[PDB]
Design a binder for this molecule. Structure first.
Ligand SMILES: O=S(=O)(c1ccc(CN2c3cc(O)c(O)cc3-c3cc(O)c(O)cc3S2(=O)=O)cc1)c1ccc(O)c(O)c1
Ligand SMILES: O=S(=O)(c1ccc(CN2c3cc(O)c(O)cc3-c3cc(O)c(O)cc3S2(=O)=O)cc1)c1ccc(O)c(O)c1
Ligand SMILES: O=P(O)(O)OC[C@H]1O[C@](O)(COP(=O)(O)O)[C@@H](O)[C@@H]1O
Ligand SMILES: O=P(O)(O)OC[C@H]1O[C@](O)(COP(=O)(O)O)[C@@H](O)[C@@H]1O
Ligand SMILES: O=P(O)(O)OC[C@H]1O[C@](O)(COP(=O)(O)O)[C@@H](O)[C@@H]1O
Ligand SMILES: O=P(O)(O)OC[C@H]1O[C@](O)(COP(=O)(O)O)[C@@H](O)[C@@H]1O
Ligand SMILES: O=C([O-])C(=O)[O-]
Ligand SMILES: O=C([O-])C(=O)[O-]
Ligand SMILES: O=C([O-])C(=O)[O-]
Ligand SMILES: O=C([O-])C(=O)[O-]
Ligand SMILES: [K+]
Ligand SMILES: [K+]
Ligand SMILES: [K+]
Ligand SMILES: [K+]
Ligand SMILES: [Mg+2]
Ligand SMILES: [Mg+2]
Ligand SMILES: [Mg+2]
Ligand SMILES: [Mg+2]
Lengths: 422, 425, 436, 425
């Protein structure tokens, strides 16, 4: 029964052609949905009650579009998101962190615009987790956004939006200085011929996967759902293909900001992503990601590859990792394990930000501290196992891989352990 | 000999990559497609695309197959659509650079227990009006195909039957349906209502994979450019869907309401043409050929053996084309199954095989009508030179190019066994 | 270049010219062969063990000390010739030569003692002489038995029974010497600790032109099963009378290593020849060159693809540790082992990194020479009060011995493999450590 | 039939990994293909008798080596005459006649820097006596090959030069030496004294790999079956060395003292023959072909393009043979570089090309003696039929086998461009 579910017959195929031939509509997904959903907040999704339904449907990142609305309007959206998120904090073993992303207006006809400087300052003051920087054309555009965030916004992630020909041509220099990328297909499809956008999307997703940096696929994914309860055949195909391409995140714009079916649009992206994730050909994907990642002397990079390899060997249900900044979980995520990466962190911001990395399931640790560091570490590892059992990630008899470090503080991950559940 | 400019076009840097990940990383929006568009476009005929003048514009935009939807309209209405298609096609019979065969496909209303009474009458109409293909609605099992085949009566055995898979049973009984069909249509409209909408992509990719493995045509259909029914430009998801159907391995892509009733039928055909050319150059032939080769069983059929030899030879020299002589279209279909980058120029005397080979990706049919030569070897050489001269006129070939030529040792279908490497003079 | 550029700037271009590293990074086996370089010097310690047959030419304590220094890891006693009194004196001389180096625990070399049986002869089962010789082996504490003419699983069960209750820890290496042994290979391997491709009798029992097929098949199947395989007979035959071997002989040694043999053997070359020490040095020199010429990239991928999924934490930790070692060009994998099993599971994935096995068992230290790339360290210190501290002291002993022995340098990365509780069978931890 | 798939290591051939390929090797799986690695036997007191030379030709000797390090010109001229008399004693049956090449192995430069005066005299003797090949001793750089070529003069332009790599400089300057040579000999005797003995296998495997990549012949030589000089059976290391030279990719294997002076010259040839057939069936063609294919550059030469198409076609149908018509041996050499499992039966009118193609693995030369037919197409067909009849008589072919036929579009060298699938009747 186990080997009939989650496209396991297709997973064992010897060629990609055979893998396609073995895909089965009756093979049900079992793993948790790995690709994060970004939902744009607007009139259709602003109320606290509506936001609670969207969190339950699978929204992981709330996008604030600073192209429209005042600072007062966006501050109320942030407060409503935080109120809806915290209404589930009463059960810490099931609570879902939700990131807040600020999408800038852009340069317009101009460097960094004066409105963007003000909006970025607003973001730092209101504690946003991510910035989606509009119309990034070169590395100096990213440096200007980084400078406008100041010393208090040092921890905010910058996702550069590639929306034009220059951004595509200067992609490598932009990615090098960014935390990740957004394939902003709306403007990109107007700036370059519409029939070429898929080449830019697939190239950028491939290069981000190679670099181990988050990549977002965005715009018109479920467009018809703005007025209709069900999407078109092209729309479900687009969502599935963005996941199969290797996108870490998928996005909804008008579908959630102004449409008549915001909750249904989130549920549809969730349903398709789970199906597409099981249809991934991990055998080739892992081998290629492994070969293309360079040799390293960083113990976190060395432990990550060892843990992902160990997970595939035993069909591990999860890789539990302790992380302060989210970096150890991100280095596991870059090899696209089938095993869920359960990230146990004390940082509420890192818990929100790791939604950018595919397959990272954040658990915010709020249990009392232990006097002995080693005892505290073990307690955090047991917390990950207990949340995993409660949420259905783990069952008795499963094997898990546990990733920890040799001393407190970030940057010291160097240990991988094989543990049998219960 | 070819130059660095040649190796920058048609995604050739991405083509030479050693991994699929590296292939994706090397895709270039500035690398322009050079080869002719190889995925055929099927356009549904209706009020928005019925006039002879509108049909001429759709033929120029790239329509290769005209679909008649027998779910609506009378026999008199469909006979007029067929006459208008044939008139528009024959208006270019004077200019060799623009004349192209256009297939006529009858899409049945559907079943009720066995084959419906209306389907028996419509299939008989199809034979009487000389349709090339039947898109059989709601095929659920092999006996449904046998019933459609029996309705093609005594005179319609040459008509191709493309089974439409529109429900759960059709997906589960896929292997037995494909075995007795000429090809398959992934009919996503009904399929997306019969099975959960989030599962349609799995059924599409599985069926395309299985058809590619079997070497049989597969059509991707429904809502590909849906928003173009009322808008002049499609959504980002729609262009992505067309590109991904081509990258999945679909031989044909289809337009329904977009060309039957929408406000932009010609623009919808142009958009599918533009995306297909881009997606075809982005195919990773290196792995696709290796996998088609490894999965395909050993063969002692000389046509199959010649086809793989010719496709291998074409990749070795970057051949501009493979010219094949075919009576039924079978030799061209066996070349097409290995997905060569080189265009497969099929020279045939059969007007029906010329229209029907549009079902096979990369097959460019040429209808030959010169009177037979007394010496068979001379008649063969005249047809080979006809394909070279048409290729030179249409942009496929130039003097100095290498072409692969596929022929047989004696007249009649079934004797293909020769592959020659020719330098264009 | 992008996959090695940063590590090349850090370790230097000189590092990446040695140990056939340009050939190691090749994308095809054809390109790997094209990049093999006679100027690319081996750096790693020799990982294929050398078995030397003891006889008149290699029996003295002084001669045995020179053979231990040349690289002999396993001493073979051929019970086809010589009395029990003769073999007991050979064992005592081996032990005296081995223990003459025990003064420095950080450099001491354990040497296994293997008893090679006379065989069944014309009989169907275990001969009466074999029953007596196997009982002699148990009484004299031999580590391994090379069982002659194994033809089926019941032959190994009979050898196991003759060893009795006291010889349960002795390893049984079944010698495949005839057609039936080749045909019944799978059932023989299943119940044996390992295999010996006994080419002398095999080359008489089957056509001489087919022996290479049997050798390559058996080595492949043992590599797949993760069990030791020995290549034996006439490897350096001409060295019995000549100081240098033939071109076919050096080729045969190199090819046995490239095939995947864990051990290579010398018979007459060391037992009766005029150059026993030079024969050991020649096998050592060739094995070092051939080990660096292994195409690890495909070998590791294929061992992974062919090996079934495992739910054993020692097995899962072993593959994780070998993967981690390849990622950082680790100088060594240090493993704590009671029976040698954790080191054997690391060894089955053929890491380029040396597997330094720290054990308290003197017998396990001798027996792990059967597994390619396992370097045994005998830990003589009594247990610490706190188990976690005792574990750390053994790891530090491995690091300090590794530094003094040239395996490790300051700045190197090492992979450390340990377990969660005392006793055999609980290995489940892998750590990445930087040498200070 | 199931019996077919149990022989010639076919279960191991179908394996998905090299590890699984090794695990499936079977000592009971008998070789079926003809032995494709050529045997070079050194001539001397033990192999000069015309009657003994006849036995060595029947045992499998393809190339007779004359070692000019020992013996006078008068002695070597007698060797040549005895070889030619033994070879020509079988010319009365053209369907079974086996050409045998004559190779002159030079004494070398000794302590000098360039071509020695004795080598200039021996090379002129070789041209005057019509030798086919020169094994040039101690080649250290490209200018050494140019000096050998100059000493052969205008009359020796057709002689093949095989450079012997015997020292450190020859290994370091390998690429420049191979570029100007026809092939290479891994001369292990001197190489094993010039460089550490434990490094010779690295040089042998590297040189064989580079020659396979270049598509140029490579010979493995010295002490392969050394103990057979005095003993009737070789050592386990000797049979292993022969098998491993074949598995490495050597086109030729050599016997020196074993045939020149030993007591078992005929048995030594039979032993190399027996091991080579076993080792050739144990080759993992699946990976070897893919790697030779990927490493070979794109080509616009029709002979090169036809060769890869024909090898691919041969694997698809399990062709028993590829019959090629060749004037210089080049078309057969280009087929040979892709290491087909199918025997390459080369039909030629050039007696010298027939002898020289033994340097290329898997090329079985047939000397056609009939004068040209009036109609060129008939002359081509007669040669193809001669290839089929010889192949049937020798056991290469049976009725029902598929064969790939490689020919050209016009007479003369350099025009191969046709590949034909033919059923043996
Ligand atoms: O285009 S192919 O060469 C091809 C496609 C996909 C894969 C395996 N894959 C893979 C490997 C990578 O390293 C990577 O970065 C992305 C993806 C990738 C990308 C996709 O767009 C997709 O639809 C599926 C995959 S995958 O299954 O995860 C391998 C090969 C191909 C396509 C169709 C065929 O029938 C065929 O034989 C081969
Ligand atoms: O060393 S390996 O990587 C290896 C060895 C051989 C091959 C396939 N092969 C191959 C491919 C080439 O392109 C080439 O030029 C030579 C040969 C080659 C060379 C040999 O020395 C040999 O004994 C066998 C082969 S082969 O089977 O034809 C592929 C891989 C290897 C060796 C042993 C293993 O158990 C294993 O899993 C992998
Ligand atoms: O992923 P990051 O940011 O590097 O954090 C990993 C760190 O977490 C730990 O496992 C636990 O550290 P803390 O006790 O400080 O939370 C460290 O040992 C390790 O260095
Ligand atoms: O693809 P098909 O239908 O088998 O037709 C291929 C046939 O065409 C030819 O090349 C030419 O035949 P005709 O001269 O009869 O057209 C045959 O030799 C070959 O058998
Ligand atoms: O390789 P083996 O025989 O399984 O031994 C590995 C064992 O060694 C240890 O690392 C140390 O155990 P001890 O304290 O008994 O020496 C265990 O944790 C582990 O189970
Ligand atoms: O291998 P080579 O030397 O290029 O010879 C191949 C030549 O042999 C042929 O098949 C037959 O030519 P001939 O009739 O002159 O012998 C030519 O068509 C072809 O060019
Ligand atoms: O801003 C965006 O998201 C776009 O243009 O697609
Ligand atoms: O009939 C069709 O084409 C469908 O249902 O998609
Ligand atoms: O017994 C042996 O060692 C042999 O036969 O090789
Ligand atoms: O000359 C040779 O053949 C050698 O030196 O090996
Ligand atoms: K914005
Ligand atoms: K219909
Ligand atoms: K014995
Ligand atoms: K000589
Ligand atoms: Mg935009
Ligand atoms: Mg329908
Ligand atoms: Mg024996
Ligand atoms: Mg010499």
């Amino acid at each position: 029964a186990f080997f009939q579910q989650q496209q396991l017959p297709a997973a064992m195929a010897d060629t990609f052609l055979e893998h396609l031939c073995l895909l089965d509509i009756d093979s049900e997904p079992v793993a948790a949905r790995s690709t994060s959903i970004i939902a744009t907040i607007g009139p259709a999704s602003r109320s606290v009650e509506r936001l609670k339904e969207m969190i339950k449907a699978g929204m992981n990142i709330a996008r604030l579009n600073f192209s429209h609305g005042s600072h007062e309007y966006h501050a109320e959206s942030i407060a409503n998101v935080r109120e809806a998120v915290e209404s589930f904090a009463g059960s810490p073993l099931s609570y879902r962190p939700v990131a807040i992303a600020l999408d800038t207006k852009g340069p317009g006809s101009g460097g960094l615009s004066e409105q963007d400087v003000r909006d970025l300052r607003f973001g730092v003051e209101h504690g946003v987790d991510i910035v989606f920087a509009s119309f990034v054309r070169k590395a100096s555009d990213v440096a200007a956004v980084r400078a406008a965030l100041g010393p208090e916004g040092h921890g905010i992630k910058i996702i550069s939006k590639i929306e034009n020909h220059e951004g595509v041509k200067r992609f490598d220099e932009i990615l090098e200085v960014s935390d990740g990328i957004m394939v902003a297909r709306g403007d990109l499809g107007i700036e370059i011929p519409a029939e070429k956008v898929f080449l830019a999307q697939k190239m950028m997703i491939g290069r981000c996967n190679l670099a181990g940096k988050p990549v977002v696929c965005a715009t018109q994914m479920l467009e018809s759902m703005i007025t209709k309860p069900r999407p078109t055949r092209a729309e479900t195909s687009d969502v599935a293909n963005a996941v199969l391409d290797g996108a870490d995140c998928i996005m909804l714009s008008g579908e959630t900001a102004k449409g008549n079916f915001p909750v249904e649009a989130v549920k549809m992206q969730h349903a398709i992503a789970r199906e597409a994730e099981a249809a991934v050909y991990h055998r080739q994907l892992f081998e290629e990601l492994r070969r293309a990642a360079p040799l390293s002397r960083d113990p976190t990079e060395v432990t990550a590859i060892g843990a992902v390899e160990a997970a595939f060997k035993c069909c591990a249900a999860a890789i539990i990792v302790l992380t302060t900044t989210g970096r150890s979980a991100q280095l596991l995520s870059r090899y696209r394990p089938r095993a869920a990466v359960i990230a146990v962190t004390r940082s509420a911001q890192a818990a929100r930000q790791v939604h950018l990395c595919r397959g990272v399931f954040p658990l915010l640790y709020r249990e009392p501290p232990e006097a002995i560091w080693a005892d505290d570490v073990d307690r955090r590892v047991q917390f990950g196992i207990e949340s995993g059992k409660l949420r259905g990630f783990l069952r008795v008899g499963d094997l898990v891989i546990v990733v920890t470090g040799w001393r407190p503080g970030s940057g010291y991950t160097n240990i991988m352990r094989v543990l049998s559940i219960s």
